[PDB]
């Protein structure tokens, strides 16, 4: 008797967990990614304004 009950109890929550983790992951990593892709571009930018002021002033 007891065997099959524990087999079901494992499988049901398992499925919850793994999907809820799969959802949560992709949301977070991309919304994070969204902003990382900024940050990359734009860093370049501030550098060149910084640099210009030195460069001309020299």
């Amino acid at each position: 008797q007891l065997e099959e009950v524990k087999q079901a109890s494992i499988k049901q929550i398992q499925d919850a967990i793994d999907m809820e983790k799969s959802q949560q992951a992709l949301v977070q990593k991309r919304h994070y990614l969204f902003d990382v892709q900024r940050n990359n571009i734009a860093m370049a930018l501030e550098v060149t304004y910084r640099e210009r002021l030195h460069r001309v002033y020299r």
Partner: protein
């Protein structure tokens, strides 16, 4: 342009898996972080000229004044950049997150957790 910053959240950042853009993130972190600190370095601007003096002992002071007026007038364009397609190279592997596993996962989570109750009985 100048510096920008969005949602730099490094742990999930690399994590992506659109594979030809997956690999990029792992490096793009370090390229970025190096970047971030390297900007965090510089001065922005340098001095403002003591023009009153440079006339004094550049007594070719037409040159001084020419360059003085030019410097007083001289206002740089800003830089070039081009990867504001990354904004949208995001939205694609911005729907991947959405569609693929937004919806998949809600769907899947529904049947499973629901699937807890009935077989909990």
């Amino acid at each position: 342009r100048k510096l920008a910053l969005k949602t730099i959240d490094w742990v999930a950042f690399g994590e992506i898996i659109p594979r030809n853009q997956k690999a990029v993130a792992n490096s793009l972190k370090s390229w970025n972080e190096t970047l971030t600190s390297r900007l965090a370095t510089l001065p922005e601007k340098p001095p403002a000229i003591d023009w009153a003096y440079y006339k004094a002992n550049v007594a070719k002071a037409g040159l001084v004044d020419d360059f003085e007026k030019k410097f007083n007038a001289l206002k740089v364009p800003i830089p070039e950049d081009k990867y504001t397609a990354q904004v949208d190279a995001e939205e694609k592997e911005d729907v991947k997150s959405c569609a693929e596993f937004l919806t998949q996962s809600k769907t899947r989570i529904q049947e499973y957790e629901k699937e807890l109750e009935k077989m909990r009985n």
